[PDB]
Amino acid sequence: YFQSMKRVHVIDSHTAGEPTRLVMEGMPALSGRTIAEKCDDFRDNHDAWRRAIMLEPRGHDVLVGALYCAPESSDASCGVIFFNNSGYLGMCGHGTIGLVASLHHLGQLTPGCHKIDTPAGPVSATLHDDGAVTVRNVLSYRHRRRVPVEVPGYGTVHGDIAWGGNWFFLVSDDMTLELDNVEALTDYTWAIRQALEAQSITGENGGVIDHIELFCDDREADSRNFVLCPGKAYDRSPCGTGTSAKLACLAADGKLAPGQVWTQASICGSRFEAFYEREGDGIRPSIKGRAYLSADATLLIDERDPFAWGIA
Amino acid sequence: MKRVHVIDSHTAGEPTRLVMEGMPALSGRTIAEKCDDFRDNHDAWRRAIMLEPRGHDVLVGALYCAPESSDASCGVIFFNNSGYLGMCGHGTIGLVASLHHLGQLTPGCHKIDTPAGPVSATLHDDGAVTVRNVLSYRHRRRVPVEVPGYGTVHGDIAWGGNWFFLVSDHDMTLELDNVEALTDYTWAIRQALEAQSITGENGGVIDHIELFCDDREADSRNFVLCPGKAYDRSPCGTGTSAKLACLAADGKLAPGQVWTQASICGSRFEAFYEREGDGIRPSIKGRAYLSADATLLIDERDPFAWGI
Ligand code: NA
Known part of the structure; x- marks a missing residue:
């Protein structure tokens, strides 16, 4: 199929027009007891991967990426690390609506109130009956x-x-x-x-x-x-x-x-x-x-490609 | 949700979105006629694929079509965020490279049918593609x-x-x-x-x-x-x-x-x-290289389903 290439499963969505790329499987495994230490691990040891999916040609300037993580907190639904074509973020409201709508369409989150761990601490997001999300800022x-x-x-x-x-x-x-x-x-x-x-x-x-x-x-x-x-x-x-x-x-x-x-x-x-x-x-x-889906995608990184890890 | 299978690639940095299945069937017997049908009766699909938030402004789209001529390997209709193109060299390189990777084209000289006539493209044994302008x-x-x-x-x-x-x-x-x-x-x-x-x-x-x-x-x-x-x-x-x-x-x-x-x-x-x-x-x-193998998803509830 594409067996010589690295594959990253992503779900692209937009929140009121502002796009989020949720990364599900294939990204480097991150280590750390908290989402903040995992974010440091990403930045320090795996930054090429941020660059491959956010820089051109795979990414484009307005996109925010969201890496799905296991929850840190005992009462959190999941964790997330947000990032873009320049670096790492803390909280990201539109990305959080994207994350929640995405996981909604996959059945992993159901209507109700969810805690989401970020490098900057927890974020409360309510998924409504009609699919909308309210995030407390x-x-x-x-x-x-x-x-x-x-x-x-x-x-x-x-x-x-x-x-x-x-x-x-x-x-x-x-x-x-x-x-x-x-x-x-x-x-x-x-x-x-x-x-x-x-x-x-x-x-x-x-x-x-x-x-x-x-x-x-x-x-x-x-x-x-x-x-x-x-x-x-x-x-x-x-x-x-x-x-x-x-x-x-x-x-x-x-x-x-x-x-x-x-x-x-x-x-x-x-x-x-x-x-x-x-x-x-x-x-x-x-x-x-309200966020809506854009794509369910396998990003492909071909090491033979001069721009495999992103154009500067 | 409408599902459209695309292979995204880029040619020396310039991206091509190859549309493979999921789009409505286009009427016509020549690629030119199918392009008119796309334009007149299915243009919202061009916009869903090419305008934000699914597409971006540097992207060219390529709809894979059955060849019309006996000696062509396939047909293609190229389009972008403003309308329909005739020939498109960089998109043809991405098309050929993509088909190569899907195992549908082998090295050799190929003819590809477009709304503006035939384009000769050679797929070389090293994966490069020469297109005749x-x-x-x-x-x-x-x-x-x-x-x-x-x-x-x-x-x-x-x-x-x-x-x-x-x-x-x-x-x-x-x-x-x-x-x-x-x-x-x-x-x-x-x-x-x-x-x-x-x-x-x-x-x-x-x-x-x-x-x-x-x-x-x-x-x-x-x-x-x-x-x-x-x-x-x-x-x-x-x-x-x-x-x-x-x-x-x-x-x-x-x-x-x-x-x-x-x-x-x-x-x-x-x-x-x-x-x-x-x-x-x-x-x-x-040369073109792959970027993604994707299913575009169009949710009819989305105010921007068919593009901003
Ligand atoms: Na008013």
């Missing part, structure tokens, strides 16, 4: 409100600096957010990101603000957004962490009450439903979204 | 074009299966880490030509731009802007055919003399030509 908060930043080529932009599991600069209403305009939106948000760094504008404790999000009105959602992610990429989904940061700002401005659902549309019209409860002076947001 | 020729030599923000650029206008502007020179450094600047420059050139109505013969839009530089191992390295502000990961079989045509016209390369072209990612094709009219018949040799 980390504590989220706003650091600063309506901070002006002069962006060469665009003048002065105001935005909130907030934390939702990543640092965001949120600019909420006159670019408008259509999918056919992503080049211009990327240029703009990129200019903002560069200006923040040039001008030493950070999150709490020096945190680099590496995500930029724009919000506008939407006919059938509370808002539509465009989200610049690290590496000049945009999120196809409404962005779980970005939407968590948005809710923190809404809460801090008294525009959204605990328990109240906010519906966030993405640049491509997919949607997340979100709500929060108060935790101290911050919020605990939950993000509900 | 359409007749290629230079239309104009050293045409000057004034590019807003970059100055005056010269290049040949040549046909290789697509219309190309081949840039005479530039101080751009053709390295993979510089694709953003190279795209900006070549896109500006492309827009400049179209604004000044600088075209191929018959008003043909020059939608590909090629830059060349020296290489330590190959005769040349290029960067190729393709439609969609995308770049070719391979040396570009049609752009290399166009280049040979220019070399041949300049008497810089003789019939049968091999030229080796490196790509922006350091992958390589070998090329040579024989004369045919006042143009050339080039052949392009490269």
Whole structure:
């Protein structure tokens, strides 16, 4: 068949348009008592494998990979290591929805509430009767409100600096957010990101603000957004962490009450439903979204191929 | 869920998705007729396979078909995220290599039926594939074009299966880490030509731009802007055919003399030509390698089932 090649079984899915590659069998065996030590093992001793499935030509820039792992915790359903074409992640909301929907379609997870171990600790994910998944996000908060930043080529932009599991600069209403305009939106948000760094504008404790999000009105959602992610990429989904940061700002401005659902549309019209409860002076947001399968695949690595382990 | 069996491969870095079973049956007796049927009655399947999130913008699709002609090994319909192609050199290499790996083609010269006529491809005993390109020729030599923000650029206008502007020179450094600047420059050139109505013969839009530089191992390295502000990961079989045509016209390369072209990612094709009219018949040799054996899955509940 392809007996001279290395075979890796993956299940590709997308969460509201943002793709996840779940890796099931064939990947190097990892050692460690916890998911974090396994992630170190992957990084230190098996990184070529991350590169083979995430770099071109097998991977493409927007993909997140998710390696299925045995559970660490006694009450966890499984463990997972997330990664991309540049390195290893901690938590990954859209990837977790992908993981859960994937394992759902394989019968390994059934409706109800599941704990999932990650290198950054446990994540609670509820699989609903209808196949949707709600993931409870980390504590989220706003650091600063309506901070002006002069962006060469665009003048002065105001935005909130907030934390939702990543640092965001949120600019909420006159670019408008259509999918056919992503080049211009990327240029703009990129200019903002560069200006923040040039001008030493950070999150709490020096945190680099590496995500930029724009919000506008939407006919059938509370808002539509465009989200610049690290590496000049945009999120196809409404962005779980970005939407968590948005809710923190809404809460801090008294525009959204605990328990109240906010519906966030993405640049491509997919949607997340979100709500929060108060935790101290911050919020605990939950993000509900839906993933669908893309492929059940055997990745093939042919050692004769000059790009077997990925193009730089 | 709809299930579609694909073999993904790449040819010098440029990926091909070979569709094998699972698609609706296409009506027609010629590959041309089956392509029209695909386009008119089953286009959503092209989009499901090629648009995000299942496909990506550098991918070419190839639907395996029964051969129409007695001496052809098979038929193929090539397509991408915008529509349907006729011939596709790099996809033909991936097709042939894939069939070889499936045990369906053995080394030798093969004829493959496409909507734009037959393509001759030789599968060599070492697994390489030579594809014979359409007749290629230079239309104009050293045409000057004034590019807003970059100055005056010269290049040949040549046909290789697509219309190309081949840039005479530039101080751009053709390295993979510089694709953003190279795209900006070549896109500006492309827009400049179209604004000044600088075209191929018959008003043909020059939608590909090629830059060349020296290489330590190959005769040349290029960067190729393709439609969609995308770049070719391979040396570009049609752009290399166009280049040979220019070399041949300049008497810089003789019939049968091999030229080796490196790509922006350091992958390589070998090329040579024989004369045919006042143009050339080039052949392009490269290699394809497998990426995945996959079942694409289309869930009708998915708002993006048939692509974003
Ligand atoms: Na609204």
